[PDB]
Each structure stands twice: as C-alpha cells, then as structure tokens.
Nucleic acid binder design. Sequence first.
RNA 1: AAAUUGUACAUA
Lengths: 328, 70
Amino acid sequence: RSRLLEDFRNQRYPNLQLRDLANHIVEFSQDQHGSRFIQQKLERATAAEKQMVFSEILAAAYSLMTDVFGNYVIQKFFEFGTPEQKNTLGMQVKGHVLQLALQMYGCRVIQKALESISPEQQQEIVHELDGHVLKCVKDQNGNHVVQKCIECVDPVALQFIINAFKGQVYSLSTHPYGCRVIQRILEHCTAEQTTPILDELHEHTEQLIQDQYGNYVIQHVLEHGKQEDKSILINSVRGKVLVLSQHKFASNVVEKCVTHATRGERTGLIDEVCTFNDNALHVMMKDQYANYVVQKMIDVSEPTQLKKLMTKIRPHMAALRKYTYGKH
Amino acid sequence: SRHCVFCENNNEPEAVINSHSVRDNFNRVLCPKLRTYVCPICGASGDSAHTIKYCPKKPIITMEDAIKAE
RNA sequence: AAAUUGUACAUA
Ligand SMILES: [Zn+2]
Ligand SMILES: [Zn+2]
C-alpha cells in the first residue's frame, strides 16, 4: 500500500470528502473500507468531485469491473451518473463483453447497466453477443446476464436467441442454468417467439417431467401459460397419476396440475384417482410423495368430488393416523 | 434443532424427545431408535438407517402392479 | 407397529 491507504485502513480521517481521495481512488476501490466510503459518499455535493472520481477511474475501468470491490463502484456510477458518463463508460466496454460477461464481477456490473442505459446502446450490446449462445447460457454467470436481458430489452431484437435454441430446447430445459433462461423466455416474449420453443417443449414432455429441472419448466407453464398449453400438458398425464405421484420431481408437477385446471380437467383427474384398486389408494396415502398430491386434491376440488372422496379413502385414514397427517 | 422429530412423532417421553437430534453435523443418523432398525428392503443400518417409506429402493408402483396384487 | 413428510436460482 501507499501512504493514504495505510492512513485510512486505520481510519485517521473522520471528516474525509471526495476531493480528499485524489490520486488514491484506484487503491481505495481495491480496498473494502475504501470502496464502501467512495460508494456511500457519492450522492451529495456537486458533480465536480463526481467528475474527478469518474476521471481517476476511467483509466482503470477494465480492472475495476473485474474487481471484487471496484464492481460496486462501477455499478453505482452506472446508476447515479449523468447520461454523458453513462455513454462514456458504455463506450470503452465494447470489444471485451465476452470476457467481461464470463467473469463474475464484470457480469454483475453488466447486469447493473442494462436497467439504466439507453435502448440504442443496449441494442449495440445485443448485436455484440451473437452466436455464442451455447457457451453463454451454459455458464454460472452468463445465464444471469441473459436473464436480465430477457427482462430489460425488446423481445424482437433478441429473437436471434429464439433461433439458437431449436434443436437444443431439450438439452437446455434439462440444464441446471438453462431452465431458468427458458422460464424467463416464456414469461417475457411474444407469441411468435414462444411458439416454436413451446412446440419444442411439447415434443419432449415425457422425459422432461421426471427431470430435476425440466419439471420447473413444466410447473412454470402450468401456472403462467395460456389455458390451451395447460390443457395440452394436462392430457399427457392421464394414465400415469399413480406412477408419477410416487416420483420425487413429477409429484410437484401433479400438484400444480390439479391447482390450475378447468372443471372438466379437475373432475376428470379426480375420476382417474377414484378408480384405483384399493391398495393403490394405500400407495397414495402411504408413499412419501403421493400424499402431497392427495392433499392438494382435497383442497381444490368442487364439493361434489369432495363428498365423493372424503368417503372414497375414509378407511385408509385409520392407517394414516400414525403419521404426521392431521386431516379433519 | 435441540430435539429429535422421530422420537417425538413416535410419542416417546419428552425427555427423550429433547435429548438428541435426528441426524448429525456430518449428516449421519443419530437417533438410536432409528439406528437400531435394519432395513428389510436394502439392509442398511445405523449411519444410513431409515424407515421403509423413505427407503431408496421402495419400488415405483405402476397400475399393472396394482392389478397383480389382488 | 417402522412412524422423520419432498427438488434449482451467483460477489466484502
Ligand atoms: Zn429420536
Ligand atoms: Zn432401505
């Protein structure tokens, strides 16, 4: 360290002001207490000192953004600065957005920028990252950025990603990070962008529900998509309710299936689980996952199915009392 | 959490309930009542002991299996 | 008597 950072890491300047940080902000932003101080005292005074801090760091931006503490600095600037500074920062960032998005703190900052900059520069960054869709969605950091873009940009500009997904919607709806990207896609797009991806999903529906991540995709379509898609998925389960209420992942899909449904779908599935060969009811009330399906069935049915069900498995109650289930 | 759920839902006396936890800081099994039990399905005992409903080999039951069992 | 009820979402 130099002199001033050894003077302030011991805290010897209780009345410090931005102007007092001259010629040491590159070292202050690399220290915790210094990045907190610069961060918290950049809302008062005039913009002259803020212009100073902007100038002393515009020379080390490519490192302060890939810095564990400088990234809060760059963030706060992208949030509070005059648009001239927004553009002046925005400029030198292009040419390395691949690397800066692969790196942790740089991608935190990238996210922080997309909610305050201009739409035009935004689309500049969009056209920056074409094609690499593969290596970017399949990353611990690229996927968060991708999500923030799905939240903040115009869908039609992003439509190229809708074309980089065909042939891959399966191997990505089953991907630990891709599935979030797919949920963001379905919750933030147009009809003509969700349509091909939704068909791609309706292809591999079977293997998707028994996957520990695709079932979040299904669950997301069941409580947010159009009624039509809901019915389309609801029918591709009739015949397997017992086999799936026993599955650890698919059981949640069953719950969120009986919740959102029409009277004909609810009554249809209730009828399917009414024709179970006695001991399969025992599998239901007994098995560690099915009983959740049972209860979410008890809570959302119409009173006709209610009184035609409180009796249907009323004997097995006696075999359920020694568990944790207190059902009146 | 300063008490064992298993011994509580099994209605063991309150002293036993608050005398141990179910599992471990290492995520083994700690409750002696549950450590004594040998799984009739997978034989596992003690450190990985578990009851039948939660056994990792409790087989998936189809419809045709529910028909054969009659 | 075998009883505990169930899966994701990142920086000091
Ligand atoms: Zn115990
Ligand atoms: Zn076992």
